[PDB]
């Protein structure tokens, strides 16, 4: 008989059932960055890719497969049909439309909603116990959308949120202080993007409040202008885009970090977008970034950060804005 | 005084001298894939990126920097001037020109050679003891070019060669056999691309010659058509391009593998392009892929693979072709 | 002291206040053609350029500056912030979005309206007494939009309209007759583009009605097929695009003509888009091209052209169509 | 009979013979900028355009024709056949190849030479008494090439040379001093581009030597670093390109200035490239920029500028380099 059968004796006619499977939807810049990061942190035994452009999809899948010798993720598959995603522990959404200059924030959101109206029901059909990690912008809204469409409990629907923002913050802090960002601690909360809130009260190195050493920290009479740090966290993503076209690497790594906490059940604390109704004064179904304990069941627990009146108010306003957009949305 | 001076007491006014530094020249798809691969295998304490397009360059540098919290590479720099590459242990060249409407292999090659005539001397100026790892196509020729321009000894000029090709081969073999490519062993040597030679004699799983189990292996009377594997190895790179535009991921992972072997002085054996004159019947200054022992000094040693006459002849002809191209090239 | 202070004695610490300032918004082909035309007719003492693409903007500004020796416009500035436009007598809008694969007239329009929702308020903030000259397509609609957003009186909001169309008409007539277009007189009114109306009644050379010499002029039984002239006026803009990519030169010269009439208070008569409600049977807030008297305050007066019923009706229908579009548009 | 014949009585069956005709070869960015500048300075009664891309050509020609009402140049024609250029007083060459990254300076020059080998003989056939104004880069070489191919006397072959460079210089001087460049005087000579020489000895405002007021002017111990001015004159064209893609406006205006001096026989002095053999120490057939008297017969006379040893030497070196390139060139 065949060379394979001459060389190999078979014990098991094998039920191929994935044990730690991850699916990425959208193989654009972000989606693929997430993919290579995940492959190189060995977070999955099966990686599935899904997109509507079949060329790009198959191409990216083959390019990865070819690097298999250098990886420890034994099944990489792709497809337009969602059966390829069956039994994922984790499904990351990076599919999205590109905002165009004229396009209202609203029109964009609605386009993306229609996209989600296609994706989420399919994902849920084939992996009804997965965690959803939403990356597509504008992310607090789309995480709400995904939650509405899936009918999943709030713990299994997570948005990438201010994870990345907080990483940029810590990087900038580190640059200012001559210390690695792993040792510079600081939190960015609320609405991802322009409206995010830097919590100065808890900025520290080695458990030393920077705010008590420098009481004017992050105010206007701040001679060292630390507000600039946060301003930069916001404008960075702009500059980077202007410069290179888009953001991929940093967000891919942030998402991989999150995935590591979930897949490995670590119970680390991350600033991610979660359904915050009831807390921080918020009284609508909106998603904002707070410090969340991530693990095998998604968001198990939430850190109640003490805020100033102004911080609480910034959040309230973000929530009112977000809600205003969300109620003009059809499911 | 400043918040920094109030928070941090300084012992050392520090000589910043990189200890394990890597430079990637060319931040296109390939270059950047190499970069993220290097960043995620913790192979470097400083990574420098160099390109002529300053926008793209700075953007990519920033996108990486923003992911610093999730990395263990504490300095990432970019620049148009080569002083940013000073003291690299390893410099990867991915820079190249894109072939255009009505451009002969020869014209494209000459343009790339002129590119190298600029890059290599600068590189050598600022890192005179580095190893050069050449990735740009056509790679055997361009590695020969780098070697000529740098005046480095043949051990410090390595070309990517058939590393990736051999990886694709092992992936395909693995697919045919239901085994991981790590355990399917097989070698592709000589000229990277179309003219490469699959050494069937040494195809094995667990030290079991496939060629002795299936003597017709890889011939034309081979009922299982194993030639197809090799054909595919060649056409893969085509299909992928056709599908997605280009190749990045696999080649990046291959290069990172090589880099690991060098930075860590492993003395693993890899099929790379080395100045092969004196061996295999070859009598011209050409580079071909053979099994090379890689370590802190680049190529320390070479494996002398037993070949058939036909194999030896394919090699001879590729070497004659390469020389034929090279002798029509001005330095 | 400095060479400057040694060479030059200063009388005045000078309030830099522009006296005849022009702003062009949008530095694409059209915008820049307008700019060189304005620079070479000596219509301005300060020219400001504004765009969202900062690279293109600064480059064009510098390329112009470098030609200063050959010009009599002593200050050329560019910028992304609208403070560089402060105190313009005249602001030309050429900014616009490009229509894409599967984009309705309506979607494109809405994108452009959103663009205007940003530009116009800024413009008005820094130059509250300027005249607005709108060039971006679809121009009658977009002039209506600028008028709505700015709250300027109808005399200060002028659209390019059928100025250029009428120029093409006169060129074609001139070709047919062997006379310069300066001496061939003829009017194209109403909706710029396909729906425009050629007023044959007033086609003349030296005050000689072509319509009375050739009563069948411009009808279907016209053996000389003068309709073709008008048809061509419409198809010209198509052919040119097909051939070269776009239109710049002619439109630029047209806009500069208009500008001359305004900056110099000439009170020449030009066919431009003006808020025509109350006249010609029109009963909606729409803009159409009629003969307008242009001068230092924009459109001071309007020529009441005698029309046939059919002409009046074409106008009525274009106005109803325009309104139909506008009522589906959000401010 | 016809409407034309009913309206117009003909005296003259007219020999159409152009009296002040200009031809532009190459309707790229530069060529068209030259064209619009010429049209707006009313330097021609007939303007002819020539290119190998027939679409682009016809398109640009129509776009100009359509602006005829606003111009005082009554015949604008285009074509691929050179009969359209017959009887030009002046033929401007802007045709050229784009230098590619890999491309040696030499390869580019040779490509352009082959282009000229097509253009010049045709131009000369149809306008044997014209002046040739060479703009294409590298311009001192191509002006030599045009002269060799045409067999015209040295007065009728002019290169754009350092006209533009000197305009940039005067603009920068003007910026530093708060004076219009028309009143800041200063000369840039020799090889256009990087190797150009700023003649500090004759830098002045109102006949006041800046070099005698500030003896260190343009040296290294110059505390005001005036060398930077010249450095910038060189890097400007680079920055502008980087920023916008290319240079058009400034060069178009420079060329139009030159054209004005020729067409109108003014005998102004301009820094243009002329066959400098015999002077400034140069002993080969090379072209460099010196101050030339331009008029109806092209370069009638030359200004003998007194130079330092170093300046003379810079020129000598430029000439030796240029010659070295030119003697490796086949006609
Ligand atoms: N929250 C965050 O921190 C960040 C979020 N993002 C977002 O990621 C998203 C995509 O970013 P990029 O990768 O740069 O875009 P990428 O544009 O280049 O492509 C997105 C992909 O989505 C796909 N897609 C569209 N409709 C689909 C459908 N119905 N089903 C499956 N796939 C579909 C496209 O085919 C495409 O491949 C955007 O929404 C962007 O804003 C980007 C950076 C950071
Ligand atoms: N050995 C292998 O198996 C493979 C080899 N390659 C080759 O590697 C090369 C890179 O491919 P891609 O990343 O897709 O191309 P990439 O084309 O998209 O761009 C190459 C980069 O090189 C840069 N560059 C050019 N000249 C430079 C200079 N003088 N100094 C600094 N930077 C310079 C460009 O700016 C560009 O960013 C190609 O030549 C390609 O054929 C590609 C895939 C696999
Ligand atoms: N009335 C007429 O006879 C004619 C009208 N037009 C119209 O004029 C417009 C310009 O055409 P082109 O110059 O070829 O287009 P151009 O497309 O090449 O680019 C338009 C410019 O507008 C800019 N822009 C867009 N949004 C902006 C903003 N929010 N702020 C500042 N700048 C912004 C872009 O950056 C771009 O540089 C088009 O809409 C076109 O249809 C064009 C030809 C003749
Ligand atoms: N000396 C100076 O001060 C300056 C010189 N230049 C030069 O002007 C030249 C063109 O510049 P651009 O307008 O930006 O290029 P443009 O590239 O966009 O196009 C040049 C034109 O030459 C044409 N052409 C090529 N072969 C031809 C032939 N055999 N017959 C007729 N036409 C032919 C092309 O079709 C094209 O339209 C280049 O050589 C450039 O270096 C540019 C700026 C300043």
Residue numbers in the entry:
A (entry chain A), B (entry chain H), C (entry chain H), D (entry chain A): 1 to 331
Paper text:
Lactate dehydrogenase A (LDH-A) is a key enzyme in anaerobic respiration that is predominantly found in skeletal muscle and catalyses the reversible conversion of pyruvate to lactate in the presence of NADH. LDH-A is overexpressed in many tumours and has therefore emerged as an attractive target for anticancer drug discovery. Mechanistically, LDH follows an ordered sequential mechanism whereby NADH binding to the cofactor-binding site precedes binding of pyruvate to the substrate-binding site; this is followed by a conformational change in which the active-site loop (residues 96–111 in hLDH) closes over the active site to provide a largely desolvated ternary complex. In humans, lactate dehydrogenase (hLDH) occurs as homotetramers or heterotetramers predominantly comprising subunits encoded by the LDH-A (or LDH-M, muscle) and LDH-B (or LDH-H, heart) genes that assemble to form hLDH-1 (B4), hLDH-2 (AB3), hLDH-3 (A2B2), hLDH-4 (A3B) and hLDH-5 (A4).
We investigated this possibility using the cofactor NADH as a proof-of-principle ligand and measured a data set from a crystal that had been soaked with NADH to 2.9 Å resolution. The average B factors for NADH are similar to the B factors of surrounding residues, indicating full occupancy of the ligand. The active-site loop remains in the open conformation after soaking, probably owing to its involvement in crystal contacts. The intra-loop interactions such as the salt bridge between Arg111 and Glu103 are thereby maintained. In contrast to the apo structure, the side chain of Arg98 engages in contacts with the NADH phosphates and appears to be more ordered, with the density being better resolved. The presence of NADH displaces at least seven water molecules, although a full analysis of the water-interaction network is hampered by the moderate resolution of the NADH binary-complex structure. In addition to the active-site loop and helix αD movements, a number of residues display rotamer changes upon binding of NADH, including residues Val25, Ile53, Glu54, Lys56, Ile115, Asn137, Ser160, Leu164, Thr247, Ile251, Ile325, Glu328 and Gln330. Our ligand-bound structure reveals NADH bound in an almost identical fashion to that seen previously in the ternary complex in the open conformation, implying that the presence or absence of oxamate does not have a significant impact on the NADH conformation. The binding of NADH only triggers small-scale local changes, indicating that the mobility of the active-site loop is hardly restricted by the presence of bound NADH. Our results show that LDH-A is able to bind NADH in this open conformation.
